[PDB]
From a paper:
Members of the bacterial T6SS amidase effector (Tae) superfamily of toxins are delivered between competing bacteria to degrade cell wall peptidoglycan. We focused on Tae1 (previously known as Tse1) from the common soil bacterium Pseudomonas aeruginosa, which is known to interact with a wide range of microbes, including E. coli. The taes encode hydrolase enzymes that induce recipient cell lysis by breaking down the major structural component of bacterial cell envelopes, PG. Furthermore, Tae1 injected into nearby kin cells is deactivated through binding by a cognate immunity protein, T6S amidase immunity protein 1 (Tai1), preventing lysis.
We were particularly struck by one variant, Tae1C110S, which is modified at a partially buried residue sitting directly behind the catalytic Cys30 site. The Cys110Ser substitution was the top-scoring GOF variant in the D-Met screen and ranked 11th amongst GOF variants in the M9 screen. Using the E. coli lysis assay, we first confirmed that Tae1C110S indeed lysed cells at a faster rate than Tae1WT in cells grown in both D-Met and M9 minimal media. We did not observe any major structural rearrangements that would immediately implicate distinct modes of Tai1PA-binding (RMSD = 0.746). However, we did observe some key side chain alterations near the Tae1C110S active site, which is the enzyme region most intimately engaged with Tai1PA upon binding. Most notably, we found that His91 protruded away from the active site of Tae1C110S, which would sterically clash with a loop of Tai1PA that typically inserts into the catalytic cleft. Our structural observations are consistent with the hypothesis that the Cys110 position is important for Tai1 recognition; therefore, serine at this position in P. aeruginosa may be disfavored to preserve immunity to the toxin. We measured Tai1-binding affinity (Kd) for recombinant Tae1WT and Tae1C110S proteins by isothermal titration calorimetry and found that Tae1WT bound Tai1 with ~36-fold greater affinity than Tae1C110S (9.5 nM Kd and 349.6 nM Kd, respectively). Indeed, for PAC110S we observed substantially reduced growth compared to PAWT on solid media but not in liquid media, where T6S is not induced. This phenotype strongly suggests that Tae1C110S lyses kin cells at a faster rate than Tai1 can bind and inhibit killing, leading to a fitness cost for this strain.
Author numbering:
A (entry chain A): 5 to 149
B (entry chain B): 4 to 149
The structure:
């Protein structure tokens, strides 16, 4: 998964949207990760992205499987629609927080409380309710060799 | 004539298509919220991505003059131009052209007032004098108003 962690580190410093650092934009951060890895990604805000992922990407059964696919070099997106705004993040390999939630990178307009540079799990980026409703989507071709 | 489109623009000015990002400060999000209000499917993404999608699936008008009269007939018309780093999109509205060339528009912009229009600037005043003559005008297949 080093190729995905590298794309995450590089995306953290780019601005998918004009004038908008990806660290402050959860949908744009994922778009730049996918663009660096050559993976087609559904476009728009987080809700629109999750709709698009649900339609065309493989949905995994668990956060444990999300971590395993990431460990096998696949781009894995954690996503959850919201009543007003959804959220997406990139899952990376690593031990599951609370033996359930995989590690991730995420941008966020909300600031550091919604951001992760690989040291928080999705269970620490999403609230104690939303984290068990998350969906994990995987792209069908490995990116890292 | 284009009142339903001008109303959508006014309503979208105060919305936030992207979390935490007012549409007046986000040219791509401003256009998404206008289209959503009108019920019009719109290519998504940043401005460059939107222009890509418009270029592939919307009818391209021949002139800014043609854009204003299609807007006057109630069609959603998007002015768009790709950039080397970032592109730009805006909603064309009816009204007399600026310098007999550039239709009036609404536009959000992260650049602030320079790139913004609430209907009193033409596309020739939000884009610089270089780009304003290279803009494309994309019209939807169905009229949204009446």
């Amino acid at each position: 998964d080093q190729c995905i962690v590298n794309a995450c580190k590089n995306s953290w410093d780019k601005s998918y949207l004009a004038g908008t650092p990806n660290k402050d934009n959860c949908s744009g951060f994922v778009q730049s990760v996918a663009a660096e890895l050559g993976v087609p990604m559904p476009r728009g805000n987080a809700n629109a992205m999750v709709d698009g992922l649900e339609q065309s990407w493989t949905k995994l059964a668990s956060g444990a499987e999300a971590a395993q696919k990431a460990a096998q070099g696949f781009l894995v997106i954690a996503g959850l629609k919201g009543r007003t705004y959804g959220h997406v993040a990139v899952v990376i390999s690593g031990p599951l927080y609370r033996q359930k939630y995989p590690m991730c990178w995420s941008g966020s307009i909300a600031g550091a409380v919604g951001q992760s540079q690989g040291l928080k799990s999705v269970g620490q980026v999403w609230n104690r309710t939303d984290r068990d409703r998350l969906n994990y989507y995987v792209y069908s071709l490995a990116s890292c060799s």
